[PDB]
Amino acid sequence: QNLKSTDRAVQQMLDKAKREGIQTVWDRYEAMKPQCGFGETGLCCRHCLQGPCRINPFGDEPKVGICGATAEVIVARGLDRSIAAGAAGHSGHAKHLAHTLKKAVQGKAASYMIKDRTKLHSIAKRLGIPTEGQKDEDIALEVAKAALADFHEKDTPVLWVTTVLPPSRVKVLSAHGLIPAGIDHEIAEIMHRTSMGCDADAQNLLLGGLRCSLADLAGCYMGTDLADILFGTPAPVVTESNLGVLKADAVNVAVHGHNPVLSDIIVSVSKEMENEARAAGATGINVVGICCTGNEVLMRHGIPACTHSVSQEMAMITGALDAMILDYQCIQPSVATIAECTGTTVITTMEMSKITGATHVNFAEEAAVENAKQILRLAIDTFKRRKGKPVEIPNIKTKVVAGFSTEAIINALSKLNANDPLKPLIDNVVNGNIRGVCLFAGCNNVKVPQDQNFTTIARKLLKQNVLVVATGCGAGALMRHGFMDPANVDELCGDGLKAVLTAIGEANGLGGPLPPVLHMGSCVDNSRAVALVAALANRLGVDLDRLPVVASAAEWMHEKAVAIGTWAVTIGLPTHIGVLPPITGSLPVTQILTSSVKDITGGYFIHELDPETAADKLLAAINERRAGLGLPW
Amino acid sequence: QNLKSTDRAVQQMLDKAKREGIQTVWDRYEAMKPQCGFGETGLCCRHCLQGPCRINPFGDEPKVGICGATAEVIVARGLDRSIAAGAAGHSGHAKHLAHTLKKAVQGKAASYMIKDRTKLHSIAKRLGIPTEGQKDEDIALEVAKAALADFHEKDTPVLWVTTVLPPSRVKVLSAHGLIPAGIDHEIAEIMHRTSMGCDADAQNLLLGGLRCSLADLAGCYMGTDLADILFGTPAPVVTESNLGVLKADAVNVAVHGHNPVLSDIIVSVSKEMENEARAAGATGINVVGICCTGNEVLMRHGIPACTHSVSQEMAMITGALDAMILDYQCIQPSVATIAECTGTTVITTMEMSKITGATHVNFAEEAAVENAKQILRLAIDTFKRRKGKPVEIPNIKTKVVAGFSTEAIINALSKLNANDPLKPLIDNVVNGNIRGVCLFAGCNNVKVPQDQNFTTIARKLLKQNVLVVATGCGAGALMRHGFMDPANVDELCGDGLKAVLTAIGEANGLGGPLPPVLHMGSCVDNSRAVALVAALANRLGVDLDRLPVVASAAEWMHEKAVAIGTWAVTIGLPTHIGVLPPITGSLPVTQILTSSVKDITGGYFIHELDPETAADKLLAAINERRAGLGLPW
Numbered sequence A, B: 001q002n003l004k005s006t007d008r009a010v011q012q013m014l015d016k017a018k019r020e021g022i023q024t025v026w027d028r029y030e031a032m033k034p035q036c037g038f039g040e041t042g043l044c045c046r047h048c049l050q051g052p053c054r055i056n057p058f059g060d061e062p063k064v065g066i067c068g069a070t071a072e073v074i075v076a077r078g079l080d081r082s083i084a085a086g087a088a089g090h091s092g093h094a095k096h097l098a099h100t101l102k103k104a105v106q107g108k109a110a111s112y113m114i115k116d117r118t119k120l121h122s123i124a125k126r127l128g129i130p131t132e133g134q135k136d137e138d139i140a141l142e143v144a145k146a147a148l149a150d151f152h153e154k155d156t157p158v159l160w161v162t163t164v165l166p167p168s169r170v171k172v173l174s175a176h177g178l179i180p181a182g183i184d185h186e187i188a189e190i191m192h193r194t195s196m197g198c199d200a201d202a203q204n205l206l207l208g209g210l211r212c213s214l215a216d217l218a219g220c221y222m223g224t225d226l227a228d229i230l231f232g233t234p235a236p237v238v239t240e241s242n243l244g245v246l247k248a249d250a251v252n253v254a255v256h257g258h259n260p261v262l263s264d265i266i267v268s269v270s271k272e273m274e275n276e277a278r279a280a281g282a283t284g285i286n287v288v289g290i291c292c293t294g295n296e297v298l299m300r301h302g303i304p305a306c307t308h309s310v311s312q313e314m315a316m317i318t319g320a321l322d323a324m325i326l327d328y329q330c331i332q333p334s335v336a337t338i339a340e341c342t343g344t345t346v347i348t349t350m351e352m353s354k355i356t357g358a359t360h361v362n363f364a365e366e367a368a369v370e371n372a373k374q375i376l377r378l379a380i381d382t383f384k385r386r387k388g389k390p391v392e393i394p395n396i397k398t399k400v401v402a403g404f405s406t407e408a409i410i411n412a413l414s415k416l417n418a419n420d421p422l423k424p425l426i427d428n429v430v431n432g433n434i435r436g437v438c439l440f441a442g443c444n445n446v447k448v449p450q451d452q453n454f455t456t457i458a459r460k461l462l463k464q465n466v467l468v469v470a471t472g473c474g475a476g477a478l479m480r481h482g483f484m485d486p487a488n489v490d491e492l493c494g495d496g497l498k499a500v501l502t503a504i505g506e507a508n509g510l511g512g513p514l515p516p517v518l519h520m521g522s523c524v525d526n527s528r529a530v531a532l533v534a535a536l537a538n539r540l541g542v543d544l545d546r547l548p549v550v551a552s553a554a555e556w557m558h559e560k561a562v563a564i565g566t567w568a569v570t571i572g573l574p575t576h577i578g579v580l581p582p583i584t585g586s587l588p589v590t591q592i593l594t595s596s597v598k599d600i601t602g603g604y605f606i607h608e609l610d611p612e613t614a615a616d617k618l619l620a621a622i623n624e625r626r627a628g629l630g631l632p633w
């Protein structure tokens, strides 16, 4: 079980699943070995009915696609479609929120409102929307319309790119024709250019993919902006994570997926109906989070994080999960089958994301509170059915300090310098107390023992005084292994980094340091890390590709993460990836993504499967950036 | 060579390529056998980096995707992405034309203009744009803005769906939630819903694909509408097709691709520079067409059709093709490699469609005429280099009568009944002179001996008094085998059909019949066939799924054609396909697409690889429709 997951709670449930004969993601992975080498290297194409075509990585025929498509065209086309699909996921999430805000300020969905008025006003002015002398509802309606307008061509490029990056970065990207003209416009253009008999030049294709990855960046940043307006900007909070946050005597309700439009309401309504849940024999309604929508409500409300990503089925295996409430993205469809064995009520809520065998509850913002009631009443009903059943909840949980929005980080720094809050951070970068900054992002992947890369790389960087921030299931991995607990700062952090986390935490009325890793939220909240390092760049008067800042998608899986890794490279960051995407079948494509893209954007991918080597390479990249500033290292 | 292509000119060039050692699409197909059975059945998924995943069609493990995705989810997700890619191709074509019209009427591209003022006005009123008292340039600017607005969400659904189909059809589609909200919106939503951990219900997934196929229909219809405004509505013309239309002593220039924004200008400018081409030793500039952009200029200007689709490389093998001018879609990237051997100058012109090793000429509508000059001067230069070389142009060509827009067909019928032009056609449907209508559409496919299915099926239907219309490379196959020559009516057509083609042709001042097959234009001009059968439905007061009308994508290949076959089914047509798409790995998915979709839209796919059986099945479908009207058959 150790080779499957480094999480001891996950290992315990893996033993339970094995003895009850419940097939898991790891069993399904084992049944799939050896995986197809053509698909693993990227040398397969099904873009037309003359296929499927493949290309031998080495040896004799086939050496070329039936239409004449070369290995480098086929590899670049497949990558582009992955970026476009990721963009479409983050795009759809942000679009849903844009519609939710518009409905709310037009009086159509009273369950939603402008919760963060100061974020609303700062966004409107970043966009150049006039605020002075306007109702909030009219400013918000303007912001929502501007959001929806970034999805298509108009007289301006995508403002959720051009107004969020340093102007020097925007100029460099414009010179290469990489600024998106519209979010869905770019997605559609990728799908066109990669279809049969279209674009057949690897470099041209990859440039289109960089541009589409910035459409994904725009979607993430818009998603974060809109969610903060509607639901509040995160501020530091304390909670717990891992399976031990389930309680045998409560109605345990998992919010799972990505979009909090639904799960933020479930959080609110669940408070009301705990009276209704005592009547069924529960202590209350124990809302817990899985994946990114769990991160959303953990970041805003302190909802304990139950589990993440590859291990999401294990929460059900406890026998104590009465309902799991789905919106979309990263939901293993196996949960619908597994629930027949574990008793859990699996509920889908979104029209374009249903799973055969799960109960569907049509959710609409106009009727959000009634929907939450209907769903939570199914959860309460399920809790009654398993009264007197034995459950096996592993007694394993960690303390999690989270909620580090960019606004919260700046506010926390302002206690050391009120008029120049970024200067203390830059000060300790310059003098070596902070070697640099590393963002961990992305998913877990069944190919990698769960959390192994995240924790191994994090341990090394923290010892070397790197300030580590994390999002999505990367934050999930670190939070479940204690990296978000301030009690662990002495163990994990080098003395320079320790000094800075202590100084900031003490000045923020804590008596104790900041946690070893700053949790910056969900996957769309990778945009928060952009807003932070962009402000650092603007305060220093340099571009992002001169900052000692790197990223690591240490165990990535989803097309969304492929898009994120690509826009990390596109905005100038050295970007480590811990699972090879299907590009090794083309040396020219691999060479562009790991080397020569440096000459376009200043960022580059770092392909490294071994996490100890990965950390060395990430430290080397941080130290090259320090040298380019003339800093000691 | 007979097993490769039924076209004798193609066979001759295949012999030349074999003896000169030039690899062809058929050789590349042979080098790819046996093709992967997982991809051929649809049982492969690469939508995340835990893959590639496959499922054994029969036997033991693997039986399920690593995430839990079933065979039916994996098959439906792959199909949806094919529909979305096809939609994106037709979408991009139409968008380019919408931008071209807007530039033209804003004074930015003087090389373009409103050539068809009566089409402009009829479109504006179908859309509800006011014409009375408005400049043409303001009506057109309104139409162009309405076109661009159909790509995104707005207060109306996609008007290039809702205003082009019978209102009874729109109501049926709306009740199933199938009307697109925006063209690129639907494409992006497909890409989202099919990514990992999203939509996992085959029926839900396929309904989304039907809706996305109507976004493709909208793109085709918009493309046809806009091209007719800018370049003229087709009217009957006479020309020739097949390789014998090349001339050894001329500068032979192939326009290849799909979008005529470029090639319509090449046609115009080539006339001017024939003086400049005599000076180099040519008789003139011989512009010939390949694929759909060749259909565009064949339909409007009588440009002879050189070849099509799978055989496009053969035009180069003659040694007489001095330039081949590309825009996008269905261009075998092998032409760039092959040109090193044949002398041809291969020129790409569009930013998102380049081929490594081809010369790129940046085309912009603002500078269209200068670009045509630069390109044609490269063609003239190439003609000089091969002076005194031997060429082998097969002396094989057919007469082609084409240009049957829906407006031309209605006008031709109006000579038999001026106030009720559709009534003579319906009259002869009712009395049996016309058994029904069959549309042939789509590509050739290397898997099928070229044109074999198109001609075999057409011969049988025409003998049985079916009125046959054709588009794209389906029209290409029929036109190269004599089906567009009126001299062939006695051989091919049954007496009832013969009577009607003769009566119409005689009444249109021809002394002779209409040709055996009515050429309705390029692939986007499949929308013309919709406009015709929609008018027939509205005149009869019934929906499309009650008309004796069918379609056959007899040899289809491209994702564009997959989308077209799907919207043919979605608007209510029995739709034969002659190559299996990757769906046979899921019985439930196959059963939906071939049977139970009948209960949603009234259309259905007819899977039939054997063309004689196909014709029987198409005749059976036509005759069922006749019986449902109470007609004899």
Ligand code: SF4
Residues within 6 Å of the ligand: A045, A046, A047, A048, A049, A050, A051, A052, A053, A065, A066, A067, A068, A069, A074, A195, A196, A197
């Ligand atoms: S697009 Fe080319 S390489 Fe891909 S399946 Fe079709 S023929 Fe093969």
Ligand code: SF4
Residues within 6 Å of the ligand: B045, B046, B047, B048, B049, B050, B051, B052, B053, B065, B066, B067, B068, B069, B074, B195, B196, B197
């Ligand atoms: S989405 Fe599911 S079936 Fe597809 S590659 Fe990923 S794990 Fe495999």
Ligand code: FES
Residues within 6 Å of the ligand: A036, A037, A038, A039, A040, A044, A045, A052, A054, B036, B039, B044, B052
């Ligand atoms: S041949 Fe296995 S991924 Fe296509």
Ligand code: FES
Residues within 6 Å of the ligand: A036, A039, A044, A052, B036, B037, B038, B039, B040, B044, B045, B052, B054
């Ligand atoms: S296993 Fe061959 S198409 Fe993927």
Ligand SMILES: [Fe+3]
Residues within 6 Å of the ligand: A290, A291, A292, A308, A309, A330, A443, A473
């Ligand atoms: Fe996740």
Ligand SMILES: [Fe+3]
Residues within 6 Å of the ligand: B290, B291, B292, B308, B309, B330, B443, B473
């Ligand atoms: Fe073609």
